[PDB]
Nucleic acid binder design. Structure first.
Ligand SMILES: Cc1cc2nc3c(=O)[nH]c(=O)nc-3n(C[C@H](O)[C@H](O)[C@H](O)COP(=O)(O)OP(=O)(O)OC[C@H]3O[C@@H](n4cnc5c(N)ncnc54)[C@H](O)[C@@H]3O)c2cc1C
Ligand SMILES: Cc1cc2nc3c(=O)[nH]c(=O)nc-3n(C[C@H](O)[C@H](O)[C@H](O)COP(=O)(O)OP(=O)(O)OC[C@H]3O[C@@H](n4cnc5c(N)ncnc54)[C@H](O)[C@@H]3O)c2cc1C
Ligand SMILES: Cc1cc2nc3c(=O)[nH]c(=O)nc-3n(C[C@H](O)[C@H](O)[C@H](O)COP(=O)(O)OP(=O)(O)OC[C@H]3O[C@@H](n4cnc5c(N)ncnc54)[C@H](O)[C@@H]3O)c2cc1C
Ligand SMILES: Cc1cc2nc3c(=O)[nH]c(=O)nc-3n(C[C@H](O)[C@H](O)[C@H](O)COP(=O)(O)OP(=O)(O)OC[C@H]3O[C@@H](n4cnc5c(N)ncnc54)[C@H](O)[C@@H]3O)c2cc1C
Lengths: 286, 286, 285, 285
DNA sequence: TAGTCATGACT
DNA sequence: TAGTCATGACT
DNA sequence: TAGTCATGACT
DNA sequence: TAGTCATGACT
């Protein structure tokens, strides 16, 4: 058997950041993710704008930004917001979700049982189960499939799409508001790629290719690529993901049973919300 | 183990000056600085103008100038201010930040622990930790990451920029006022380089390349170099740095625990307040 | 110093129907109503279409129609419903709300107190209080202002309007559906008047003259009176009223405290529910 | 030698409503108000919009509206908001502040002394003092000059102005957004007067004639009267007032000493929060 | 005394 | 949210 | 299948 | 504060 300090279930932004924070504070951590489709972290750009996250309180952002700048590096980007300019914090999403410091098993967690020395995680098709003292369940919108709670009763999914163009760079990165609580954001996510999203947040059963095409046109029109059929040519990739939401939430970080944590509910401002949860977990586990 | 009389954390203006003042007082001193980007001392000119610093009081600027002249040499510069002339005190920043009398470990202080005698400076990646009877933390705007206090709760950063032209000298060194509390200052910092800065002090998150360009255009126009593309030609270097600022302080010099000092907040009038604090450390550390 | 068998608070359809039923069952009954505006019975047509009331069950609608036909008389009207025809039961609202067998005090009930003998109905501006062994509070959407049970906590109002044109008669009476659960109804409510309504049920606070005029024009178009400026001529009278509604209840008929009953929530299907609740009150009092 | 049940200091909205509520609950109440300028009730329109007051909770606003409609009458007004319509509750300010049921001494309360039977209210320039078992201080922004609790330590003023045009009526009453979270409100406060306000709430010491003219022009433009020179023609009256505000409190209703109450802090949602505090005072005195 | 720069509330 | 006021500090 | 209405969340 | 999105009961 595998016996470690911490097992993190889920390797999206929340499970990645929480595990690496624990590993970089000295703990032995192992991750498990079944790479299921629809994960909300795949389309993420990891943009963190003060205006979007200030509702948290200085008690929460600066703890988060220090963790991210220390562990990953927070680069600041200035976006064209109208004629004025606004600065947005950024972590490279490929850097967070690609970091390999914490080993990650590509298995599906089937059960979570407590033992004398702590918790035991069961995996489909494996009579063996992993074991650790502390377990973090950061399974996004699927967290209510492994952990139960009152807060976990409000867990719902709000899906969205982002588009990444290859071999392209924007001379001006922008945030263009088009509706209440909705803004089209375009920027260079890589030195060779452009990411655009309009903030659409819809229940996955109400999402469809036609509603996705409306968001493609809004995003494509904003970088003047509408009309060229870039999707069918393989020049743009459409990125779909389900964001976890629990009304009445920055996110849900609750010790459901002694030693078993649930981390989900990050909705829109997730990278910053994950840093807080990681700061709090390294504070409460170390 | 390393065991010394004094360990100074930080080798910007404050830690360089304090360490060297303490060494010249007979003490065995060692320094630790991780050369993280954005330090507020790198764009510094070390100009000390009485109209700017006399708010300090004769009780403080006079010991400060005596220390600085004894250790480094205070040269006087005659500046053109409009139709008048003003003399500004100066120390060569290359001489203060380059002095090698105090050896400096290029490491990151991770913790400061008390031991039976003295303090233990813990460093990333080193199972061994440094030790001295007294520790001075001159970590600028990061001082509150290692030391905690009531005063240190107001520690903030005020960023600014200066421009250093290569292979150039000014026939007239000048101070040209452009706004309340604001003046553009140009002079020869070296026999081959011209330094210009406008005094802009912004919260680092509100700084951007467009905000920097207003300060470049102001500074270039002051030496008739705007329009010639000196930046893209590599003829001028832009120097960005974060000043440590605390509302309500010449600077902050406080013994947080017996033998543990915090030294920061020297945003306004830094070299002169650093000379004062160093004069005080020489008197109060045995 | 007045002491009777039953005091019925509220003289709308439910309080009128229950009081008169109790009076004819032998009991000495008196009513109290402050004639406050917005009462839900004023626009009422007392139309009862089987399709609308069948959900309650024959165990309830059959007693109600028996009580109503005994006391008031139930008439059948044939309505044009599309290409088909349908029969609707009817009681004259002027006969139910105008009946004088039970006298009615025109005062506002301010409180309901228990006494050695029974319940005491306190009246605004009068130190004397009315007294009866039983009190039935049929106060429409205001019943929760005098009785404070749990069920009455969901009591809300669903407002609507009906229009009565004067000196007019319809050769064809109709139920013409225009949206899900919504139909415009025109018929002869009197031998000299036409009554029209579209079934709109809006929260009273979200009601306004623009929304009322949308219901007027829907109703005028249904009787070919749009274009004639009937409103500015004073040819049509607008009748606004708040229906009492409680989710999960034909209506609420509950003895909250001994001898103290709450009767409300009859939303749409009020006359048939009022006949039912009165049948039970005649049995239980 | 005046001795009553309750003495209410302050005759703006909070003391007016509380005094009249206590008087109608059987208590003998008198008021004292020195008619000092800058009171926050003079520019008041007594508009109560659910979107603004629901943060209070049904447990407070519904009791409050029941009291106001019982004592004064709550009218509903439909306002044009954008292309939509919204309902706002209303009480006539002339009815609340002009009611004469509770007599009001026009004197300045200079001190509050405890006596064996109750509290003694001293009046400037007057040797004798009034006395009552309970005293409510509803002194708006000056309440902390007579009661010195810790909560009253945050009592500050938020000034504003409203404009009443004479011999004018609006065909459409409106709430027009002019910035995020800022709206100009226009309506007919009387059958012969139009009231307009823009909701400006400023530290009283930063108010001046120039800043007032900015609100006059915003309000005049909103009713298409900019350019007619209504101010210098005497056709519009400017009404300046200080709202009492305490950060962290619907309003402050506290029994500071046995029988001595403080009632203030109703800057946002004043008439409705005064209705709530009055319901509680009738319950607790 | 002014312009610069920041912070907070938000019918 | 975003976007507009309001308020205050401060080579 | 559908059209109201109402009620709240919402970088 | 406005448009977008969800939910639920309904002559
Ligand atoms: C269009 C779009 C744009 C976005 N933009 C931004 C942005 O600008 N900035 C930002 O910070 N965030 C952004 N996000 C991210 C947003 O914050 C999401 O809420 C965030 O990705 C939540 O990630 P998570 O780790 O909570 O969930 P997920 O990424 O869904 O992680 C859950 C993981 O759990 C695994 N898992 C679940 N159940 C099991 C199981 N039983 N066994 C094993 N593994 C399991 C899944 O495989 C998955 O990898 C964006 C998202 C979208 C869709
Ligand atoms: C544009 C500009 C112009 C200026 N002009 C002048 C001028 O004309 N005259 C003047 O006197 N001053 C000037 N200054 C300087 C100003 O006074 C600054 O306040 C001063 O440099 C502050 O220096 P410091 O030593 O406190 O901070 P810093 O120089 O930032 O020193 C802090 C040091 O600590 C190190 N450090 C931090 N944390 C750790 C850790 N955990 N472990 C190890 N090392 C650590 C950092 O690497 C850094 O070197 C200017 C500054 C700027 C930006
Ligand atoms: C547009 C429209 C169309 C309708 N069509 C029909 C139809 O076709 N068929 C049908 O059967 N019904 C119809 N109705 C009526 C509907 O069924 C109502 O639900 C019914 O009228 C409810 O009546 P109620 O007696 O329960 O309430 P109300 O009629 O409101 O009676 C309550 C009475 O209590 C009084 N009251 C309240 N508080 C006090 C107090 N403190 N003191 C004294 N008195 C007090 C009020 O003055 C009022 O008179 C219609 C209603 C409307 C608005
Ligand atoms: C521009 C504007 C618009 C408004 N619009 C509305 C609206 O739409 N709806 C609404 O409900 N409200 C509105 N208000 C009112 C707001 O709610 C006020 O906060 C409210 O009027 C406060 O009432 P109060 O009774 O506490 O204070 P005030 O009316 O100020 O009453 C205090 C009274 O105390 C008296 N007093 C004080 N000290 C003494 C003393 N020592 N001796 C004797 N008398 C004394 C004063 O003379 C004064 O009469 C508005 C106000 C303004 C300025």
């Amino acid at each position: 058997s595998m016996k470690t300090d911490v097992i993190v279930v889920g390797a999206g932004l929340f499970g990645s950041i929480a595990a690496k924070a624990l590993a970089q504070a000295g703990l032995a951590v192992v991750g498990v993710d079944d790479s299921r489709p629809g994960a909300g972290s795949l389309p993420a750009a990891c943009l963190m704008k003060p205006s979007w996250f200030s509702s948290m309180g200085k008690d929460k952002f600066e703890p988060s930004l220090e963790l991210l700048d220390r562990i990953y590096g927070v680069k600041d980007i200035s976006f064209k917001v109208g004629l004025l300019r606004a600065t947005v914090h950024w972590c490279d999403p490929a850097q967070i979700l690609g970091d390999e410091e914490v080993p990650v098993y590509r298995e599906k967690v089937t059960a979570l049982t407590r033992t004398s020395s702590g918790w035991a995680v069961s995996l489909e098709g494996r009579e063996a189960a992993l074991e650790a003292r502390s377990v973090v369940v950061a399974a996004g919108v699927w967290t209510s499939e492994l952990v139960r709670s009152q807060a976990l009763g409000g867990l719902v999914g709000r899906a969205g799409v982002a588009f990444r163009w290859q071999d392209m760079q924007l001379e001006e990165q922008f945030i263009s508001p088009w509706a209440p609580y909705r803004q089209t954001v375009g920027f260079n996510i890589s030195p060779t790629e452009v990411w655009v999203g309009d903030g659409s947040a819809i229940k996955p059963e109400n999402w469809n290719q036609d509603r996705q095409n409306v968001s493609y046109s809004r995003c494509a029109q904003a970088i003047d690529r509408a009309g060229f059929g870039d999707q069918e040519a393989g020049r743009v990739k459409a990125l779909y993901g389900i964001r976890p939401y629990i009304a009445g939430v920055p996110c849900l970080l609750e010790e459901v049973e002694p030693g078993l944590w649930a981390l989900t509910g990050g909705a829109k401002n997730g990278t910053i919300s994950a840093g807080w949860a990681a700061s709090e977990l390294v504070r409460r586990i170390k």
